[PDB]
Amino acid sequence: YFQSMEKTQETVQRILLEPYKYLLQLPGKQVRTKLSQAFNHWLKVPEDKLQIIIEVTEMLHNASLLIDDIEDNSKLRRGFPVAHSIYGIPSVINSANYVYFLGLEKVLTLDHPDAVKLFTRQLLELHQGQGLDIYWRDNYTCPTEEEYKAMVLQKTGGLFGLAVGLMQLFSDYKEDLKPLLNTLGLFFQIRDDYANLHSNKSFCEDLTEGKFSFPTIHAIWSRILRQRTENIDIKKDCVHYLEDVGSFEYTRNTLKELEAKAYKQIDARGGNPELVALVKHLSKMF
Amino acid sequence: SMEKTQETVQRILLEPYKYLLQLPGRTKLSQAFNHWLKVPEDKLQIIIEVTEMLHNASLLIDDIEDNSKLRRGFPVAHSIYGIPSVINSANYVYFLGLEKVLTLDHPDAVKLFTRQLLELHQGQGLDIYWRDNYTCPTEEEYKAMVLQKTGGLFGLAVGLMQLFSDYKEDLKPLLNTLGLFFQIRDDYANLHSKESFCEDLTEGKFSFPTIHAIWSKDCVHYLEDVGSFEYTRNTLKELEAKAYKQIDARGGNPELVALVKHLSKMF
Numbered sequence A: 001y002f003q004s005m006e007k008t009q010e011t012v013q014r015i016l017l018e019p020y021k022y023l024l025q026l027p028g029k030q031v032r033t034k035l036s037q038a039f040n041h042w043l044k045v046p047e048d049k050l051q052i053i054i055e056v057t058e059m060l061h062n063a064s065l066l067i068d069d070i071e072d073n074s075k076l077r078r079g080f081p082v083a084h085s086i087y088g089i090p091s092v093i094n095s096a097n098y099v100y101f102l103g104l105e106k107v108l109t110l111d112h113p114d115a116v117k118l119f120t121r122q123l124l125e126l127h128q129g130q131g132l133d134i135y136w137r138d139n140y141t142c143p144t145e146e147e148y149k150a151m152v153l154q155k156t157g158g159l160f161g162l163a164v165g166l167m168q169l170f171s172d173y174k175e176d177l178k179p180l181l182n183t184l185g186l187f188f189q190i191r192d193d194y195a196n197l198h199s200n201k202s203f204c205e206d207l208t209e210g211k212f213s214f215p216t217i218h219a220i221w222s223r224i225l226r227q228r229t230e231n232i233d234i235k236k237d238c239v240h241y242l243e244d245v246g247s248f249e250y251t252r253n254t255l256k257e258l259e260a261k262a263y264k265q266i267d268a269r270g271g272n273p274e275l276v277a278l279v280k281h282l283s284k285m286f
Numbered sequence B: 001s002m003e004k005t006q007e008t009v010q011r012i013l014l015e016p017y018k019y020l021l022q023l024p025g026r027t028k029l030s031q032a033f034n035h036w037l038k039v040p041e042d043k044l045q046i047i048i049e050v051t052e053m054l055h056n057a058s059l060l061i062d063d064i065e066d067n068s069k070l071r072r073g074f075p076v077a078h079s080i081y082g083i084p085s086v087i088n089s090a091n092y093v094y095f096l097g098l099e100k101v102l103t104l105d106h107p108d109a110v111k112l113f114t115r116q117l118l119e120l121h122q123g124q125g126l127d128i129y130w131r132d133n134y135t136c137p138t139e140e141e142y143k144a145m146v147l148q149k150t151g152g153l154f155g156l157a158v159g160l161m162q163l164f165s166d167y168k169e170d171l172k173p174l175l176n177t178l179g180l181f182f183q184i185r186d187d188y189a190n191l192h193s194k195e196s197f198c199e200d201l202t203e204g205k206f207s208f209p210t211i212h213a214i215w216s217k218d219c220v221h222y223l224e225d226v227g228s229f230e231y232t233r234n235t236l237k238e239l240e241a242k243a244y245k246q247i248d249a250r251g252g253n254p255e256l257v258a259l260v261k262h263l264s265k266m267f
């Protein structure tokens, strides 16, 4: 009886997923699933399949935030400590990477040859995104609004696209959604950026949790050479300086613009009341 | 100006990977197994590259995870490029490897890559688990972890080559034996070199001689005192023997025996 194996197997799986679970236990998953279902209104995909897609998509999302936190050197997330301050860097890297490959295992269960091709590209896309973020930081600068957007579409907005890409593989709906997907990607991220600041006498780096954020970008470019982001970064009571230059204003407008661009591109794809409810629910904070 | 900056970032992401490859000091090996597996060169080359890619990506992450200061005498990658870059290079490379495994155009090859990478992540799992709890594996737990890390990559490379062979005889037994053989051999080498604490010379890494010491100031002298070098020399002899045995079983392999002989010289 070598049950000492089974024990160490059961043990290691638990540990491997603890950082991942510390992040799932924050508020979140609720909305990213009202989304899938909504899109399925066009793509009419079987239920077993949609669940697997949603799980995979949620797996990558969370594992990526674990890493973003380490890379941006964040102290908090949604008010709590970041996972690596509690579990340590090693264990968190190990956990996030382990989840990516479990995401892979899981994609395989879809049992459709293009699924891995699609997964693989997204994962490469995502890391390139992280790369950009570290690049701007190594050069003591800050992206433009246009460059920020592009980074979002690659990172943790890009991921919808995988979700809907994989769904499409199981649908006869073959009209092109990439456009509407970009639009929602930017809309979710920027909403979030907005929400998180519009939320001490705190400085800007501290509120953004060391992350590039739409309102703080715009503010930095708005009063060849690099950007000297230290003034809008260590500017006391940010949630004012940001009222002052009017970035909260600009952002609200930017979101209103995208809200509307969505409703346009949605009608172009036939209409989808399920999703329009979801947009208008989501708009109500501006 | 977004597409230029995009390409530049893909050249950048590979820099920590290449730092590690350029370090001074597995390819007699691949051909040696190819003796049984009669693999198409083109497919072989792809397997070799995937294996190398995955192997060094994983060394990058191990060095972060073990907080190692050196590797073969050189500063570890993250001490030069920083943790964010290294995490970010190694993971990019792992998925470049998956991309490359897809060019094999065999559906079980993704199946296998996944299993092996899962197995590997569980191995580092235990490694970090033990370090985080102020503890040390016993001999059997160490042997087992090693088999999960290197049996992970070894097994991957031999598993892939076997998908492209009509040689279907079971090779895991020999691979476990070699997997232990190389690790423990390396542990023995690293330390036997000696003219000074132990987590320092092992470089954050759990090591066979030390582990055996631990379950009975200066480290190289302490291991002499308890006869760990002694014990490990025996343990390696037992392993070499066992390998010669498991090779005869599989039809023999002059090239592989020649290699095991070259490696054993130092014990």
Ligand SMILES: O=P(O)(O)C(Nc1nc(-c2ccccc2)nc2sccc12)P(=O)(O)O
Residues within 6 Å of the ligand: B105, B106, B107, B162, B163, B164, B165, B166
């Ligand atoms: O069934 P086979 O012995 O031809 C196969 N070997 C191969 N399968 C495949 C393969 C490719 C796509 C789908 C299924 C098998 N390709 C190749 S190329 C050289 C060998 C080989 P397996 O992996 O089951 O031993």
